[PDB]
Amino acid sequence: GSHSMRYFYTAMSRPGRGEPRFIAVGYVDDTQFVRFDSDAASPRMAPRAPWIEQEGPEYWDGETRNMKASAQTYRENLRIALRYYNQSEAGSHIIQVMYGCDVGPDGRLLRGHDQSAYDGKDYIALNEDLSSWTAADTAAQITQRKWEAARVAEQLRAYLEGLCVEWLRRYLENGKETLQRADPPKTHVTHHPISDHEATLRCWALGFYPAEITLTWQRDGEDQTQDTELVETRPAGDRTFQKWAAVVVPSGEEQRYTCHVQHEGLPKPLTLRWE
């Protein structure tokens, strides 16, 4: 299938409680493979997946150096952001950044990302062209004019087209046993009455990888979109994910309901009923 590499940075100021915390995680698809935390005893870019551990001293030294540099830069950005928004120095604020690349089945760059936020709101985003910027407000427009003057987009694109794609491809090869393996959902339907008149049918998907999945209920073959309770996909802790979808049905009409499961691990979609 296709694949993505993403890094996620989180910087949070905490006045009176020392300098901003900087935490960084790296993912390939839905598999975390590195982390960095400035609040750790000995902050270093550290492995969180078996296939990354083979990388040598120079690797970890490099990545760590990047994380420390970025840490300092985003501490200054927090200061900068206070001035742009006319905010006081007593409040706690957060800068978030996500970036990375998507490749196709053949390892070709499908598209690149570089998005930043301030206090949970969009701040500035590299456009899909990797040459221009979308700024969310007049403060971000200030950053934009700085980044235009400095050919920042130019640098990003050279990364997203070069090192990002190359390293992702290397990771996909080093971790092929897992990163290139989809585990299909294990599926079943449960039934619990609410009253004389109504019963809950709940369609389960367990143990699947990657997280992307579609669970839908049809009644008489018609999607029950506005009528289905759909819980957030949740990690199991063993690499896999879980989800369910529930519908409230009239007692005696359970066989008019079917559950439909779409997932990459499944050759074709599955249809389930209550047994």
Binding site: G26, N66, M67, E76, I142, K146, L163
Partner: peptide
């Protein structure tokens, strides 16, 4: 290098 050895002031 896998992260970007880039990082920019706002």
């Amino acid at each position: 290098s896998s992260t970007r050895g880039i990082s920019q002031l706002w």
